[PDB]
Each structure stands twice: as C-alpha cells, then as structure tokens.
RNA sequence: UGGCGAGUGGGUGAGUGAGG
RNA sequence: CCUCACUCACCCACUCGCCA
C-alpha cells in the first residue's frame, strides 16, 4: 500500500583479484518493468556494488513518485553506513574510527543525497531464509556484472 | 605537530578463486 | 553444502614504524 518493497544486491566476481566485475540488481517483483541488472561504473568492488544497488532502487522510486520504500539488502555495511555512520562522517570530515579517509566517501555522499525526501525501512536480508526476492536481485546483479563497463 | 604504512585483539556484514 | 586460498571496508581498542 503506502510503502513499496524492493530487493537490491551488489555482486563482484573476482573481488580482490586482478579482473573484478561488479554488477547491481534491483528487483521490484515478477515481470516488473523496472527490474534491472546492470554493470557497476567505477572501481569494481563488492561494497560499492551493494551501495549502488540501493542507490539505483531509490533513484527508480523517485521516477515513479514513490517516497516510501522497504529496501532489502544483505549488506550491513550499506545499512549501517547510511543509517549510522554518514551522520558522524559529515560532522568529522569523513574519517573512520582508525583516523583514515572513508574510501567510498563519494558513494555514500551519493546515497545520502538520494535518501533525502524518502522514508526508507532499511531491511537486512537474513542469511539463508528463502526470500525469493533476494535470490531474484542476486541473479540480476550477476547478469549486470557480465555486461560491459 | 601534520601526513602516511604495516600489524594485533575484539566486532559487523558481505564479495570471491580453485576444487568436489 | 563441504574443503583449501583470499579481499571489501566499516566499528571500537591497541602496537610497532616511515615521512616532513
């Protein structure tokens, strides 16, 4: 009704190896025309793919005039980054607790921008758990990673 | 004082490669 | 699902360093 459920995933074959390929998947439901599986731009890593899958879902929601989302992801790094860490980063100059610069600053800046004006329930997909929407987003992400950058 | 680096302990969750 | 080998990057504490 009021909120719309979306599943997101970012994947990266060869994460940490010499030829990484990162993809994003966004799943709105069976046959939904906004389902996407696309290649990630920029540095090819799992963490950026997980962040940008969430960004893509929010961007798409705004094109549909949706401002209330239930956004699933398996990435607690993405969830805790956007719900807890970016507030402190804006306040301290984007330094980690170890005193180093946040590596994916520009990705979290992009995500934070996209969350303005949105009500999002950020939902962690529990390990295993048989959520078909999560497996569908994962398959879309793997399709995207096979596409050209 | 201001910049970096390599590690250790404890956490949070992910992404892989070779196999079977 | 299992084995072996990994990174991605955050939250919190620490250690030893390099530079000006």
From Swiss-Prot:
One of its GO terms (molecular function) is magnesium ion binding. One of its GO terms (biological process) is RNA catabolic process. Changing residue 49 to V: In PEOB2; has partial residual endonuclease activity. Residues 1-146 form the RNase H type-1 domain. Mg(2+) 1 binds at residues 9, 50, 74. Mg(2+) 2 binds at residues 9, 138. It catalyses: Endonucleolytic cleavage to 5'-phosphomonoester. Binds 1 Mg(2+) ion per subunit. May bind a second metal ion at a regulatory site, or after substrate binding. Changing residue 6 to I: In PEOB2; has partial residual endonuclease activity. Coiled coil: none annotated. Ubiquitous. GO terms for cellular component: mitochondrial matrix; mitochondrion. It is found in: Cytoplasm. Its EC number is 3.1.26.4. In the presence of magnesium, manganese is inhibitory. The keyword Transcription does not apply. Its cofactor is Mg(2+). Keywords: Cytoplasm, Disease variant, Endonuclease, Hydrolase, Magnesium, Metal-binding, Nuclease, Primary mitochondrial disease, Progressive external ophthalmoplegia. The keyword Cytoplasm applies. Monomer. Belongs to the RNase H family. It is linked to Progressive external ophthalmoplegia with mitochondrial DNA deletions, autosomal recessive 2: A form of progressive external ophthalmoplegia, a mitochondrial myopathy characterized by progressive paralysis of the levator palpebrae, orbicularis oculi, and extraocular muscles. PEOB2 patients manifest exercise intolerance, muscle weakness, and signs and symptoms of spinocerebellar ataxia, such as impaired gait and dysarthria. Some patients may have respiratory insufficiency. Endonuclease that specifically degrades the RNA of RNA-DNA hybrids. Plays a role in RNA polymerase II (RNAp II) transcription termination by degrading R-loop RNA-DNA hybrid formation at G-rich pause sites located downstream of the poly(A) site and behind the elongating RNAp II. This is Ribonuclease H1. It comes from Homo sapiens. The chain holds residues 137 to 285 of 286 of the full protein.
